[PDB]
Amino acid sequence: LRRDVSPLIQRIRAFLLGREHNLALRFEDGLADRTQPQPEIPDGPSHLLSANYYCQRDGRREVLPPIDLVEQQKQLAASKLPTPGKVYAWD
Amino acid sequence: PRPLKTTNPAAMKRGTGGRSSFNGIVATVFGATGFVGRYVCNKLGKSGTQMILPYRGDDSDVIRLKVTGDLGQVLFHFYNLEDPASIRDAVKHSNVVINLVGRDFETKNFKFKDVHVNGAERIARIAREAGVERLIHLSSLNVEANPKDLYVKGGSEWLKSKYEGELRV
Amino acid sequence: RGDIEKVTHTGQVFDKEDYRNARFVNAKRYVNENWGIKLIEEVPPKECTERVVFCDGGDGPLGHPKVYINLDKPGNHICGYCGLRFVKK
Amino acid sequence: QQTLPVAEVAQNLPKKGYSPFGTKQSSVAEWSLARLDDLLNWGRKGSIWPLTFGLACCAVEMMHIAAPRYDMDRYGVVFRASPRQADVIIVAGTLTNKMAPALRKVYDQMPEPRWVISMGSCANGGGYYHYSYSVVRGCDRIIPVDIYVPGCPPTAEALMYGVLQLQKKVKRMKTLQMWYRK
Amino acid sequence: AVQQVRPILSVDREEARKRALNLYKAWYRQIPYIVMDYDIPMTVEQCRDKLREEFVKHRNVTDIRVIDMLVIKGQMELKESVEIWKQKGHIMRYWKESQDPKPTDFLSKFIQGVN
Amino acid sequence: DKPTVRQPDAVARSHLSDFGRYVAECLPKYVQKVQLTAGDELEVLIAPEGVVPVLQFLKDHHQAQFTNLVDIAGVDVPCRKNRFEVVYNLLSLRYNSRIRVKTYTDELTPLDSACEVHKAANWYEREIWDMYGVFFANHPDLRRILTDYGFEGHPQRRDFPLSGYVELRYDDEKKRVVCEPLELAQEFRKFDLSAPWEQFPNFRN
Amino acid sequence: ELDGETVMRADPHIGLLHRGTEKLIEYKTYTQALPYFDRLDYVSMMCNEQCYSLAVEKLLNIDVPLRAKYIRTLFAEITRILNHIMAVGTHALDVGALTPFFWLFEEREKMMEFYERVSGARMHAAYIRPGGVSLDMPLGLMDDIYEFASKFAERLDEVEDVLTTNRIWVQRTEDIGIVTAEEALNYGFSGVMLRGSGIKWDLRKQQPYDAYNLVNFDVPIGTKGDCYDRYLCRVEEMRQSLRIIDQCLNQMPAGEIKTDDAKVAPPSRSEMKTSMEALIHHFKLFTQGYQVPPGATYTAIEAPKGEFGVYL
Amino acid sequence: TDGGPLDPKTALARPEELEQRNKLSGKITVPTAVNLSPISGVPEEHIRERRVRIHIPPKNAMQSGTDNVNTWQIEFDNRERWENPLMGWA
Amino acid sequence: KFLGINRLTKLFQMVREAGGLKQAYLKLYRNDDLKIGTLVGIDKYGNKYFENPYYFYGRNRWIEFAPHVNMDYDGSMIPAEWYGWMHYKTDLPPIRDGCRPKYKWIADHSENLSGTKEAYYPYSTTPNKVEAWEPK
Amino acid sequence: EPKDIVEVPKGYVYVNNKELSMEFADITDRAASTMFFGELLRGFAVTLAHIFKEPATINYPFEKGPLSPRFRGEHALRRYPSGEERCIACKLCEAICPAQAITIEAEERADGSRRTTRYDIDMTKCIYCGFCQEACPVDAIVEGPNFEFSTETHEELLYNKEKLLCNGDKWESEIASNLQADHLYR
Numbered sequence A: 001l002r003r004d005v006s007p008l009i010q011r012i013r014a015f016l017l018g019r020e021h022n023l024a025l026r027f028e029d030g031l032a033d034r035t036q037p038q039p040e041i042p043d044g045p046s047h048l049l050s051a052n053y054y055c056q057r058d059g060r061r062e063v064l065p066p067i068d069l070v071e072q073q074k075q076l077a078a079s080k081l082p083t084p085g086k087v088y089a090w091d
Numbered sequence B: 001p002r003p004l005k006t007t008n009p010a011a012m013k014r015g016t017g018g019r020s021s022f023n024g025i026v027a028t029v030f031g032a033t034g035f036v037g038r039y040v041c042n043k044l045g046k047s048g049t050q051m052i053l054p055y056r057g058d059d060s061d062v063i064r065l066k067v068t069g070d071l072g073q074v075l076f077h078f079y080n081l082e083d084p085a086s087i088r089d090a091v092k093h094s095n096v097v098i099n100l101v102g103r104d105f106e107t108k109n110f111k112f113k114d115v116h117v118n119g120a121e122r123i124a125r126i127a128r129e130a131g132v133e134r135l136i137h138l139s140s141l142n143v144e145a146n147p148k149d150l151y152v153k154g155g156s157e158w159l160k161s162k163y164e165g166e167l168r169v
Numbered sequence C: 001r002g003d004i005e006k007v008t009h010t011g012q013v014f015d016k017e018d019y020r021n022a023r024f025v026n027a028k029r030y031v032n033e034n035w036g037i038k039l040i041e042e043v044p045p046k047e048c049t050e051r052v053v054f055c056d057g058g059d060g061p062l063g064h065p066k067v068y069i070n071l072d073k074p075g076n077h078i079c080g081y082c083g084l085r086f087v088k089k
Numbered sequence D: 001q002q003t004l005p006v007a008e009v010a011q012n013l014p015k016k017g018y019s020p021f022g023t024k025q026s027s028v029a030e031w032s033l034a035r036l037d038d039l040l041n042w043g044r045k046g047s048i049w050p051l052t053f054g055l056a057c058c059a060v061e062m063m064h065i066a067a068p069r070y071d072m073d074r075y076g077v078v079f080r081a082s083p084r085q086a087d088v089i090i091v092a093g094t095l096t097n098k099m100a101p102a103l104r105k106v107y108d109q110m111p112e113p114r115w116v117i118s119m120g121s122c123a124n125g126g127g128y129y130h131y132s133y134s135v136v137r138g139c140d141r142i143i144p145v146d147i148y149v150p151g152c153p154p155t156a157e158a159l160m161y162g163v164l165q166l167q168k169k170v171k172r173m174k175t176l177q178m179w180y181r182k
Numbered sequence E: 001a002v003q004q005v006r007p008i009l010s011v012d013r014e015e016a017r018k019r020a021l022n023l024y025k026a027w028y029r030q031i032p033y034i035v036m037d038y039d040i041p042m043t044v045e046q047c048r049d050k051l052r053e054e055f056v057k058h059r060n061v062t063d064i065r066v067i068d069m070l071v072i073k074g075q076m077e078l079k080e081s082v083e084i085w086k087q088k089g090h091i092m093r094y095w096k097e098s099q100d101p102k103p104t105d106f107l108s109k110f111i112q113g114v115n
Numbered sequence F: 001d002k003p004t005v006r007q008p009d010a011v012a013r014s015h016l017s018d019f020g021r022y023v024a025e026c027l028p029k030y031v032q033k034v035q036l037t038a039g040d041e042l043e044v045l046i047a048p049e050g051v052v053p054v055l056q057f058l059k060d061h062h063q064a065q066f067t068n069l070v071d072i073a074g075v076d077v078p079c080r081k082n083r084f085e086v087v088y089n090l091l092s093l094r095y096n097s098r099i100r101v102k103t104y105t106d107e108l109t110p111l112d113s114a115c116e117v118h119k120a121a122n123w124y125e126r127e128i129w130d131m132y133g134v135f136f137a138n139h140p141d142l143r144r145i146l147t148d149y150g151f152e153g154h155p156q157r158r159d160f161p162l163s164g165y166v167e168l169r170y171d172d173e174k175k176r177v178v179c180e181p182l183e184l185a186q187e188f189r190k191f192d193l194s195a196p197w198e199q200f201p202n203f204r205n
Numbered sequence G: 001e002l003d004g005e006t007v008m009r010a011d012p013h014i015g016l017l018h019r020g021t022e023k024l025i026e027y028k029t030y031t032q033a034l035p036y037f038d039r040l041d042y043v044s045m046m047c048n049e050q051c052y053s054l055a056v057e058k059l060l061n062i063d064v065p066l067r068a069k070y071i072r073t074l075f076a077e078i079t080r081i082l083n084h085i086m087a088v089g090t091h092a093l094d095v096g097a098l099t100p101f102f103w104l105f106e107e108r109e110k111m112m113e114f115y116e117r118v119s120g121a122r123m124h125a126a127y128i129r130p131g132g133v134s135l136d137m138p139l140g141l142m143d144d145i146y147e148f149a150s151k152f153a154e155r156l157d158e159v160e161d162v163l164t165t166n167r168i169w170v171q172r173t174e175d176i177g178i179v180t181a182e183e184a185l186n187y188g189f190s191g192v193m194l195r196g197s198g199i200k201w202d203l204r205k206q207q208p209y210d211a212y213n214l215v216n217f218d219v220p221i222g223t224k225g226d227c228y229d230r231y232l233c234r235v236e237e238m239r240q241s242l243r244i245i246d247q248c249l250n251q252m253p254a255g256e257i258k259t260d261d262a263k264v265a266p267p268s269r270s271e272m273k274t275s276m277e278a279l280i281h282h283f284k285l286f287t288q289g290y291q292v293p294p295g296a297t298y299t300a301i302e303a304p305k306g307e308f309g310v311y312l
Numbered sequence H: 001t002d003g004g005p006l007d008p009k010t011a012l013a014r015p016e017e018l019e020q021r022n023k024l025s026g027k028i029t030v031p032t033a034v035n036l037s038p039i040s041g042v043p044e045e046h047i048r049e050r051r052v053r054i055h056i057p058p059k060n061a062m063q064s065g066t067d068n069v070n071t072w073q074i075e076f077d078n079r080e081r082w083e084n085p086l087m088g089w090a
Numbered sequence I: 001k002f003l004g005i006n007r008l009t010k011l012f013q014m015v016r017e018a019g020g021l022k023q024a025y026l027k028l029y030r031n032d033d034l035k036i037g038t039l040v041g042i043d044k045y046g047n048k049y050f051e052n053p054y055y056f057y058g059r060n061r062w063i064e065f066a067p068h069v070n071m072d073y074d075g076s077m078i079p080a081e082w083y084g085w086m087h088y089k090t091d092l093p094p095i096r097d098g099c100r101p102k103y104k105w106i107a108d109h110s111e112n113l114s115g116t117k118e119a120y121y122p123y124s125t126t127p128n129k130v131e132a133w134e135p136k
Numbered sequence J: 001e002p003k004d005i006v007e008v009p010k011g012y013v014y015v016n017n018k019e020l021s022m023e024f025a026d027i028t029d030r031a032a033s034t035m036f037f038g039e040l041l042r043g044f045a046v047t048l049a050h051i052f053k054e055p056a057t058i059n060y061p062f063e064k065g066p067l068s069p070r071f072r073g074e075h076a077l078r079r080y081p082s083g084e085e086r087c088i089a090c091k092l093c094e095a096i097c098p099a100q101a102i103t104i105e106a107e108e109r110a111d112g113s114r115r116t117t118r119y120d121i122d123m124t125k126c127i128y129c130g131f132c133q134e135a136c137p138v139d140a141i142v143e144g145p146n147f148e149f150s151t152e153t154h155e156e157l158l159y160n161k162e163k164l165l166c167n168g169d170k171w172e173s174e175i176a177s178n179l180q181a182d183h184l185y186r
């Protein structure tokens, strides 16, 4: 079915490998067909025609200029020390 | 006073002095394999001259001359001095023909008359019949009618051959 | 050789006095023998009944984008993408 | 432009033969020099030795003719480190401003006969970095090129097409017959 | 007008002039080792004349930060010439040995090309 | 919900807000403005004279152990009075975060080198020397790193053209690779892709 | 600078392959600037496309679907195997072992065949884009990738049987090039050179991106910091990449391949031929491209050589 | 100050070295009109020959939008373009 | 006989199927491997396409070139219809591939003509756009 | 079993972490593998086993490697089934060509149709990326299956409009099959 050596040389190769040998070389029986039926890619979450508007889906307009943190604290104000994040132990 | 033959906007001089531009000269460089021919090809390719380089031998001898010119400015041709049809194909679209063809020793196929006199006559006659404006054939400094031999018997055949070639051109 | 003096479908040919025909002494000139104009006027016009018709290249998704041509004006109406001609009697 | 002939016309034509210079040349000395040139070009198109150069990504493809799918050693092609022990330099990758005298020195120290394969779009004409300041516009303007492998990464099929076309160029290369007709 | 900036290796003009003269001395010492090693077709006297011309075309500047930036760049070329760090193709770039000279009269510029 | 819109991290926003106010409280002299951009990244705009201590503070404080300096990026903005800006990107492994420290530099004004703090900058500022041309004082080795040895000018400066000023070829009467003025065989076709209608109304203020 | 055979001063000179990439990126559209990143790093490519795509998607504030996330994760670990096979073969040629170069480049050529199957190019795929992937995977890629991942464990077992246990490889790798961890942190190391020196730091686990937090794997940590620990760390990243490939072949959902912002992602050919606004969005996405909002970002991923960052 | 170990490269340095470090840490007075032509690396021919036009770019007359008008820009004078004799590019 | 004597029998079957010892020698000289397989197709230009699924993937389908050429075979002799079948793009040979079109303007296949007098050389396709005076 | 120097955390793997055993059996085992070349003989055994394997080489050019219908090769200009060339000179492909290889010049044709008069592709500036294939609205420019088009001369790698039309005429069947088997992926 598949091109290989006779099983005496196969047993010699399996003894010299130290393990049972699976064929590295690919064959036509192990692979899929080259001609496949024509697929249909399904629609995503917003190809519905009724409910969606772009104003609720526009990620490019929901960004803002960066927030001055001292000015933000000054506007909104008129224990452990602050860390940049959760403590991770890489030791 | 001095008429301009081409009168085509693609054929006139354009651009600056670099290699990618065109200087309006379409030069055919005979004997470009040799010692003077490399420097002549480089000085032509510095100014953006479209060059037709005819070679008589192998392609590996003239593959080094693609460096001097840009893309489209170097065109190789195969010729022989016993065949005027290849020279007619070479100089049919040339304004300048440069003759650097020469040999310092006798060859079993080409004698001194066959390379300095008769081959120069074939090149010059084909270039005159093809409408080439200029021809810049070289010579030797001490060319004479009867150059007397100084040391060897049979010497100064080269100088006499270059002299007879230059008056016949 | 006749390919040097042959004219392409864009109306281009090099002159006999031009230096640019010296590039074709060692490599032949490529002129496409299938001009698009002759093969688009060889196709007969399509007779239609409706006032407007749609064109999509004849292949569906593999043609051009679908456009609608009006046929109330007398004459042959040419699709601007594929060059097919429609007519209404 | 000509096409490949129809099988009836192909059956009408005879076999081409191995020799590109023809069978007979109507002279004993011309036939002897043509057969000596055939033996020499067989010895030269067999086992061209490329150079371990590898400027860029196109080089990774160069190991895919080393890799056992394509096996460049089947054709005689085998890499050598020194430029003196090499026929071919495969200029494959981006040739920059700092590598102009490097490539010129490595090409010049390589001995005649010299054939250069230009693999990849950067080595052919600059490619995706053509309009930059540092990249030399192709490797033609420094060193001569005999074979232009066109793919940006070429398939190793397409690189061995360039290698086989170089072997066919060496097979058509004639020096002794040129010496007889010079 | 007036501006308060951080200096580069010198406060006044005299130190920048001393650094430029130190560049000239170091380049003078480095020229005979450049000539014998780099395989260039330039005589030692031609190299010193080119060094003089390179200093002459930068005599016109007056600002001390511009002068010290020129000193830093000249020290970089000196360090790229003490260690070899370069080829013969880049040493000859100062002479511009491949560029054919262009005429300056208006008639020859009119005849040759619009540049 | 909104599957197209990217969902941010609220706890990372709160942690970087508290740490940015902590940094602005700790160094009132050198820290000029602390901002928190979209995408949960903190930018600490600083004075030039505070280029070396603040990073040292960010190397050595107990709530600021930014041990890795991953890269230094230079941005050339020619419209400003101080032209170049220099962006230090630092990664903290202990608190698992990143910070950006941005400063401004003229074409002649120095920057104090961060090689005493982070040794990776030992080449990184060299790249900023080669691409832009800002002098880094107290540098152990300041040389051009990426360009040619005989190269003149600084490439990624916006006053420099895209294709450079010169080209290289091989010349046989000098037997050398030589330098020629730049002539393209085909010029770089510049495309006008400027937006004629504005799209973002939040960035005009 | 050498006193004998031993080095005194090793100074690297670079810029020999400097192509002016960033100045050139400044002149192109983001879609045109995407094939640059295939040519930044040569032997891992879909990782660099992933990093640039996460940079543009963080600037655009859009989100990729789950299927595109799993495709990006699966091809990122396939790309990791390719980089490690490149690293193992390069280190074997530099040390002197000629054989595992070819023995692993057969499998590496199988993965570039997989790349050609999914994208159409063997190496520079241009596949991972801002807003998902360009194309869906073709039918039957599952069986091919599964057969390859079934055999690759035995191929690595044979390569490790030749290379790992040998005394010459140990004497050529162990106690050589030892880097301390404080030097690794001070000199800005990233990736395996951090992981070989005992530092527990993997960017796929600490700051996860593109569905790495729905898959489970192990982070290999070296002990000594020499060449042998980094080689064993690369082989363990190879095996854990096989594990992540197994999990991604085990679970993937059915759905879209790209985001549905038609002003960001290009539309398909059916709504090209039928609809009108999709033709407008195609024309303005392939003439001038999308409008990225103004601002700065730095997105860093775990490439197999280390942290790969883009400051856009 | 602190009673820890002092910095050895400042205590052991000569008085000329302490004066050299303090003078570079200060601020010098310079003119604000600075010519940076030899520093920028431009060839001198483009310095003496090219003319620079500062302009607001023209609005496209077929389009009502004025967002691309909203900046000023520097552009350089148009030199000679030509057709290459091989294939016909600019 | 458990050592491969049946493979020697298959080699002798290969020799008898090749057309004789001299024909097997000629086939082994031209094609560097000697193999057996079912004949799938014969392209107009005279090449033969064989496919045997017994071999390694990549050696399943192969081409024996036209007998009128020798030592001039290359990868450009394969026509457009058999190109996807030889490169494993489709599993359908063009004998039963009814989807492949055949128009009047489709030219026949050509090989690579570089290094030959009939090569390609580019030119400007647009004509002259600036007309001169023409005083007469 | 050898002991562990550092206790591993959950989800991490430590390599070179096992302490060498100091008992007599393991020392004798590593001593016998030292003086009798145990791992060298194991590597020689693995290598001698892989001598007996089947090669993965393919007989180029008689045998060619596997490919895909999406494969990017030589650019080609398709035509309609009626015979008219598909390209309508919209310059989307050149606007998206990221190395600016394509050069398009156009005018109105004599029948009034919008057509090209110059379609140049610098094949030495191309990167074979398929952006012109995706950008093309009428599916005119495609990447053909051809990749054996290595030339001896740099000028032959600068395609004219006529060379691309000849490539579209020559490679029409395989390009039509690929766009039949690939169009719903795009």
Ligand SMILES: CCCCCCCCCCCCCCCCCC(=O)OC[C@H](COP(=O)([O-])OCC[N+](C)(C)C)OC(=O)CCCCCCCCCCCCCCCCC
Pocket: G167, J034, J035, J036, J037, J040, J044
């Ligand atoms: C059909 C044939 C198949 C096999 C063919 C191939 C044959 C095997 C390989 C041949 C040589 C291959 C190339 C050279 C490889 C060299 C490897 C090498 O030496 O590496 C260095 C390594 C180094 O050892 P290491 O790797 O343990 O290093 C750590 C130790 N230090 C650093 C201190 C050295 O190995 C050796 O040197 C091992 C010893 C080799 C010499 C053998 C000594 C035997 C002593 C006598 C034994 C007595 C037993 C008890 C008797 C009791 C009596 C009462």
Ligand SMILES: NC(=O)C1=CN([C@@H]2O[C@H](COP(=O)(O)OP(=O)(O)OC[C@H]3O[C@@H](n4cnc5c(N)ncnc54)[C@H](OP(=O)(O)O)[C@@H]3O)[C@@H](O)[C@H]2O)C=CC1
Pocket: B030, B031, B032, B033, B034, B035, B036, B037, B056, B057, B061, B081, B099, B100, B101, B102, B103, B104, B110, B114, B115, B119, B138, B139, B140, B141, D182
């Ligand atoms: N010192 C000098 O060199 C001097 C030279 N001259 C003259 O200058 C000219 C060029 O000199 P130079 O370069 O040194 O000489 P070379 O010998 O170096 O070059 C001569 C050239 O002519 C070609 N050639 C030689 N014989 C023939 C032939 N029979 N048919 C066709 N072509 C042939 C050669 O081709 P290929 O190499 O392929 O065989 C080569 O390209 C000659 O006319 C010479 O007489 C005058 C005075 C001094």
Ligand code: SF4
Pocket: D056, D057, D058, D059, D092, D093, D094, D119, D120, D121, D122, D123, D127, D128, D151, D152, D153, D154, G039, J127
């Ligand atoms: S031609 Fe393409 S693959 Fe080759 S070096 Fe250039 S970008 Fe890389």
Ligand code: SF4
Pocket: J075, J093, J096, J097, J098, J099, J101, J102, J121, J125, J126, J127, J128, J129, J130, J131, J132, J133
């Ligand atoms: S494949 Fe890409 S690089 Fe090549 S012509 Fe098309 S768009 Fe340009």
Ligand code: SF4
Pocket: J086, J087, J088, J089, J090, J091, J092, J093, J094, J104, J135, J136, J137, J138, J139, J140, J141
């Ligand atoms: S995108 Fe297509 S139709 Fe438009 S100019 Fe290009 S090839 Fe022609």
Ligand SMILES: [Zn+2]
Pocket: C055, C056, C057, C064, C079, C080, C081, C082, C083, C084
């Ligand atoms: Zn239509």
